[PDB]
Paper text:
Two structures of Mtrs from homologous Actinobacteria are presented in this work; [name] Ms from the M. tuberculosis model organism M. smegmatis and [name] Re from [name], a biocatalyst used for the bioremediation of toxic compounds. In [name] Re , both monomers show strong density for the FAD cofactor, which is tightly stabilized in its binding pocket through several polar interactions. The conserved and redox-active Cys pair responsible for substrate reduction is located on the si face of the isoalloxazine ring of FAD, with the cysteines (Cys39 and Cys44) forming a disulfide bond. The conserved His–Glu ion pair (His442 and Glu447) essential for proton transfer is located at the C-terminal end, positioning it in close proximity to the FAD cofactor of the opposite monomer. No electron density was observed for NADPH in the [name] structures reported in this study, as is often the case for oxidoreductase structures where no NADPH has been included in the crystallization setup. However, amino-acid substitutions in this motif are commonly seen in NADPH-consuming reductases, and the basic amino acids present in [name] Re (for example Arg199 and Arg205) are likely to serve a homologous role in the stabilization of the 2′ phosphate group of the pyridine nucleotide. Hence, by direct comparison, the NADPH nicotinamide ring of [name] Re would be stabilized between the re face of the isoalloxazine ring of FAD and the phenyl group of Phe178 through stacking interactions. The crystal contacts between the monomers were analyzed with PISA using the [name] Re structure, showing a total buried surface area of 3405 Å2, which is in strong agreement with the total interface area calculated for the dimeric GR. Structural comparison of [name] ([name] Re ) with deposited PDB structures using the DALI protein structure comparison server shows that [name] is highly similar to other disulfide oxidoreductases.
The NADPH-dependent FAD-containing oxidoreductase mycothiol disulfide reductase ([name]) is known to reduce oxidized mycothiol disulfide (MSSM) to MSH, which is crucial to maintain the cellular redox balance. [name] belongs to a group of NAD(P)H-dependent homodimeric oxidoreductases with a tightly bound flavin adenine dinucleotide (FAD) cofactor per subunit. The crystal structures of [name] Re and [name] Ms confirm that [name] is a homodimer, as also supported by molecular-weight estimations during protein purification. In addition, each subunit contains a catalytic redox-active disulfide/Cys pair that is responsible for the reduction of their respective and structurally unique disulfide-bonded substrates.
Residue numbers in the entry:
A (entry chain B), B (entry chain A): 1 to 458
Write the structure that this text describes.
């Protein structure tokens, strides 16, 4: 057996750990799929490249309301797929080389890793290795309902849909999460009619109810939305696919995209042989120092975190990287803890949505004395420039102190507009201070935040 | 003579002064032109409404770089003018109503006001009034070169160009400031040929040298740029206008736009009769209490401020309004001081520009030990989604402390992207904390700021 000071399962956020301070130690990296993890190859980055092209198309079909006449002649889907992965694939693959060929003290294994012992890992390549410390960066994988993975019909996930040969005439999406609603926006804007099937009574059910409700009402005018009904059976009739719901409705289309959720891959690693505890949802249990229940074993990313988000896994990687070099199970004094406090999320759909902190419901359930202002985009000068009638910025702050508790933006550049709120929240800045203690450029999209704060009572 | 507790010259930011705390006080408002001041009617608001339509036109003409085929059929200038001012004039006039219709104890004068005495004001309507306190909100007026306003040729300024009946085939602009380059962006994107004549060797001379330099290179590939030689004569040959420069070049076109700068309106008020001091360029002299040299008189806005910016003038009104109600010339303890420190500016041209703090030159001339990072838009995942090759985020931070001293962004949504820097600066937030002490949404335009901070040397 080959011994290492460090073994890393997962080339996602796991690849960000080895830097200069580790040069004197030999590292083993295990990657069963594409190099670079879900984020680079089939997730955050390539998705938003399609979203951008879809937003350009939306600009064109709506240009009349601004007094500019234009026609959307067509979309070259193949050339879009060509352009996106024409940049993604050389990058994923350039890093794979770096780790296996420059490899100053690194060894890459291309197999499914599995714990056979304490720090004993079957590589899936026919080898077994040992490590002084191990980091689990196994991420998550799409959840496929049994009704789909038994019918025998062709279905898609984020792992292949972005590489379709042609644009589907009718896309049927199973799911109401951010993956489903982002793909609905991408495809519908480019020319596909999208049908979305949701189990819940709203799309993006788990967001603030005012955001979830209004987006659903806007979505109903853009896509064929079917809520409240779980699917019951799937039937493939040639190239056409039919999906039967519990209420009896049958949704037929060209391509079936499954986006019902993601499952952390901890259950695939044989963690029981390593003494790594799994909780009730399949995430590996770690502490504020990302140290698991097992010695010398850390975890990060979708395999452990409650927020299956890249910027979270990257933050935790900074913590693991530092805690890796000290006396982890001996000295907590030199250890850094992970800050899981003001985690933002974004949905790149139309309208685009971003959040951070608590929903208004969550604020009241905690029994908080709050003030709330929902500011309309079309009420600031920049919102008029856009002739906006959908955008809102809802800020929930606390009465008396002005301590902001949450912010929810639905509208253009939502993931960027919220950043001043993320910033003020993360550093304890009061809302009355954020409004008046700085200048806001007039007139820019930013002014919606300022007026949201100015409309807040105390 | 009619006596008042307060007289206000200027319906721009001056109209924002009377609130609830003045209900028991009689107020006189003097406005010689259109109600609402420059920003609402011929300035801040209507320009950015045109700029957005120009961004729609640009999106369509460049959309193929994303794999979307579209044609710019035409531009409906008349329909642009109606849509912009179709909401602007009912608002200006709705506000004119409110002050004469709600008017609890307020009187509006539509005439050119001039100080004839201490606090004695000729209304320009044939009356003379006095007030216990006076606020000057007279703003500024366009500067017209003598060669232009003597030639007898028809010329336009920002006060009428947005009300042209038709789109000019070839627009000739005299100026290199933010007004010239915003209008250069507006017309060229909509179909006009644009010639820009600047006396300087760069457009936007007053920006960070790297920002001004790259923007000029980009402008030169979009417009007919004439640098380094001042104009000498203007001669009209029918409807066509020809402008001769000092080097001998003659730039001819159909429409002449003058955008060389603005002059504060202090010189027109007969101010010496009031003992209100004017400095060396014509702004009314005030202190941190917006107090002029004469008792009972304040000033604000473009008529006094060094920053002829709306968000500044609105802030100064907040100070004047509060200090108006106390004994400013007796007890400074209860008074509001104006914060003129982290004033941002933005130019809504192609590419969009925003700045705050110190330029690299200003930082070095001030003898600070600085570090600089110029981050390109196309280096974060969102820059790939746009296929950006022009955007930059330049951050100037101090070595050792990481305290930011300046930030300069050229690219999409520059006035919104920069706001986290304005905020972090305004509350003394360091780069080391701002970068890592908060979460940034992946992948959004915001990440360009994050990596700019990550690239700073200490
Ligand atoms: C469609 C989609 C869109 C997304 N959009 C966003 C977004 O906008 N913003 C955001 O912040 N996040 C987004 N995410 C989430 C982000 O892509 C991931 O959550 C992120 O990569 C988490 O990092 P990770 O390394 O833990 O996961 P991963 O990147 O999946 O890393 C896990 C790695 O381990 C490997 N592995 C698994 N099992 C084995 C084994 N047995 N042996 C060897 N190797 C193995 C996998 O091949 C993979 O390379 C998105 C995800 C998806 C699917
Ligand atoms: C084209 C353009 C674009 C701009 N864009 C921006 C931008 O994006 N952001 C920004 O922050 N700033 C911008 N500005 C600057 C902005 O217009 C000013 O900073 C702001 O309007 C200052 O407000 P004010 O009330 O002091 O000036 P004004 O709005 O001009 O108010 C002065 C008013 O007083 C009246 N008046 C003058 N003299 C007399 C008199 N003797 N008697 C009676 N009434 C009188 C005038 O008619 C006018 O209505 C722009 C300016 C222009 C010209």
């Amino acid at each position: 057996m080959t011994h290492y000071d460090l073994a890393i399962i997962g080339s996602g956020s796991g690849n960000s750990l080895p830097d200069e301070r580790f040069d004197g130690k030999k590292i083993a990296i295990l990657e069963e799929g594409t190099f670079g993890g879900t984020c680079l190859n089939v997730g955050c980055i390539p998705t938003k490249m399609f979203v951008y092209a879809a937003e350009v198309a939306r600009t064109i079909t709506t240009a009349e309301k601004y007094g500019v006449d234009a026609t959307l002649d067509g979309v070259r889907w193949s050339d879009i797929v060509k352009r996106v992965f024409g940049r993604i694939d050389p990058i994923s693959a350039g890093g794979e080389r770096y780790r296996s060929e420059d490899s100053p003290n690194t060894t890459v294994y291309r197999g499914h890793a599995t714990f056979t012992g304490d720090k004993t890992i079957d590589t899936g390549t026919g080898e077994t290795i040992t490590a002084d410390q191990v980091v689990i960066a196994a991420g998550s994988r799409p959840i496929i309902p049994e009704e789909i993975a038994s019918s025998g019909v062709k279905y898609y996930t984020n792992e292949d849909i972005m590489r379709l040969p042609e644009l589907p005439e009718h896309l049927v999406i199973v799911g109401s999460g951010f993956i489903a609603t982002e793909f609905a926006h991408v495809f519908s804007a480019l020319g596909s009619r999208v049908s979305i099937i949701g189990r819940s009574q709203r799309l993006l059910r788990h967001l603030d109810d005012e955001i979830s409700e209004r987006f659903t009402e806007l979505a109903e005018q853009k896509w064929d939305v079917h809520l409240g009904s779980p699917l019951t059976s799937v039937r493939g009739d040639g190239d056409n696919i039919a999906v039967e719901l519990a209420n009896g409705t049958v949704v037929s289309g060209d391509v079936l995209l499954v986006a019902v959720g993601r499952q952390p891959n901890g259950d695939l690693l044989g963690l029981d042989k390593a003494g790594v505890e799994l909780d009730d949802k399949g995430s590996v249990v770690v502490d504020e120092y990302q140290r698991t229940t097992a010695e010398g074993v850390f975890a990060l990313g979708d395999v452990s975190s409650p927020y299956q988000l890249k910027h979270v896994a990257n933050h935790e990687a900074r913590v693991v990287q530092h805690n890796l070099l000290q006396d982890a199970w001996k000295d907590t004094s030199g250890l850094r803890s992970t800050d899981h406090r003001f985690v933002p999320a974004a949905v790149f759909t139309d309208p685009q949505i971003a959040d951070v902190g608590m929903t208004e419901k969550q604020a009241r359930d905690a029994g908080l004395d709050i003030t709330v202002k929902v500011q309309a985009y079309g009420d600031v000068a920049y919102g008029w420039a856009m002739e906006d009638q959908e955008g809102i910025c809802k800020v929930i702050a606390e009465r008396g102190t002005g301590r902001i508790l949450g912010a929810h933006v639905m509208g253009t550049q939502a993931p960027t507009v919220i950043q001043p709120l993320i910033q003020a929240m993360s550093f304890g800045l009061s809302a009355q201070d954020m409004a008046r203690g700085q200048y806001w450029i007039h007139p820019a999209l930013a002014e919606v935040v300022e007026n949201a704060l100015l409309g807040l009572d105390i």
